[PDB]
Amino acid sequence: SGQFELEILSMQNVNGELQNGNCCGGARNPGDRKCTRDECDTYFKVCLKEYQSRVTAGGPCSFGSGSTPVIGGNTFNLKASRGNDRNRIVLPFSFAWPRSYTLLVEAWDSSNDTVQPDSIIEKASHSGMINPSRQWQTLKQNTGVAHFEYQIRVTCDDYYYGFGCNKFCRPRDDFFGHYACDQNGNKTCMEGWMGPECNRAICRQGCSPKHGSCKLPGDCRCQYGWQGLYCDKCIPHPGCVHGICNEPWQCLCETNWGGQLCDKDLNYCGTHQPCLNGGTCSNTGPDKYQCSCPEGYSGPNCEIVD
Ligand SMILES: *[C@@H]1O[C@H](CO)[C@@H](O)[C@H](O)[C@H]1NC(C)=O
Ligand SMILES: *[C@@H]1O[C@@H](C)[C@@H](O)[C@@H](O)[C@@H]1O
Ligand SMILES: [Ca+2]
């Protein structure tokens, strides 16, 4: 989104003549050929269109057209003046600025009280190249009887960048992005954000790429069944005692532990030493054993004496 602006700087028509050779409304004085009966009522028409190597006099004003109201007589100098809504033409555009253009600028005499219509004083035309910039470029139409000067520029609208004023960037800090804008309209992510729109939170250094995730920067939220600072430890089956997991909800037994919960001792003899009075213990199953009793002892643990 941009604007092509045109400002009138000066007009000099010392005798008050039209392009056709006649005076701006009135009779020419025989001899001195001075136009003394009236002065021009000078206004300007502007036509902006696509580049033409061979500039046509007519045709459509594709990029826009405009006119100023009457802004002075035969001669006026606005060079030391500021320039207001009356002596300037604004031509907005929403298409990417093509750099190349054709510009028609004409000085006209107003006649809205007499028999004759509005008549052209002088015409300027050219084709050129212009990039977005706040800097004005002066152009002078000083080849005919009436001379005029004007300045032009192309400016980008707010948050627009590049040669076509077409690249949009407005800084943001919400669920659509967390960034600032470059001098080129590029997005520069706030600390803790990544991706083209700076909308992907950077997770805790070491966060599991398989089981860890983000919503806010610096965190590590675990996938269901995963735990730990880096979400890289599985959660064993609830109820698991002497077992481990490689995957969530597993209960893989440690040595000499049995059962789905790894709570059944396969070395009851080693852990409890239940055979009393010099008896020998034998592991025979989960939480199971058998005692072989010396002479004079009886019972499951050789506890019955005599
Ligand atoms: C930065 O801006 C330039 C000019 O528009 C563009 O070519 C380039 O791809 C941009 N870089 C990034 C990271 O978008
Ligand atoms: C196991 O069996 C019992 C009866 C005793 O003889 C022990 O010394 C042996 O280790
Ligand atoms: Ca007039």
UniProtKB/Swiss-Prot annotation:
Record annotation: effect of changing residue 14 to L: In biliary atresia; extrahepatic
Tissue-wise expression: Widely expressed in adult and fetal tissues. In cervix epithelium expressed in undifferentiated subcolumnar reserve cells and squamous metaplasia. Expression is up-regulated in cervical squamous cell carcinoma. Expressed in bone marrow cell line HS-27a which supports the long-term maintenance of immature progenitor cells.
Residue intervals of the EGF-like domain: 199-232, 233-263, 265-303
Record protein name field: Protein jagged-1
Lineage: Eukaryota, Metazoa, Chordata, Craniata, Vertebrata
Result when mutating residue 6 to S: In ALGS1; the mutant is unable to activate Notch signaling
Organism: Homo sapiens
Disease the record associates with this protein: Alagille syndrome 1: A form of Alagille syndrome, an autosomal dominant multisystem disorder. It is clinically defined by hepatic bile duct paucity and cholestasis in association with cardiac, skeletal, and ophthalmologic manifestations. There are characteristic facial features and less frequent clinical involvement of the renal and vascular systems.
Location(s), subcellular: Membrane; Cell membrane
Region (Important for interaction with NOTCH1): 168-176
All copies of domain DSL, residue ranges: 154-198
Subunit relationships: Interacts with NOTCH2 and NOTCH3. Interacts with NOTCH1 (in the presence of calcium ions).
Span within the parent record: 32 to 335 of 1218
Disulphide bridges, residue numbers: 156-165, 169-181, 189-198, 203-214, 207-220, 222-231, 234-245, 240-251, 253-262, 269-281, 275-291, 293-302
Coiled-coil stretches noted in the UniProt entry, renumbered to this chain: none
Residues with attached carbohydrate: 112, 186
Domain remarks: The second EGF-like domain is atypical.
Function: Ligand for multiple Notch receptors and involved in the mediation of Notch signaling. May be involved in cell-fate decisions during hematopoiesis. Seems to be involved in early and late stages of mammalian cardiovascular development. Inhibits myoblast differentiation. Enhances fibroblast growth factor-induced angiogenesis (in vitro).
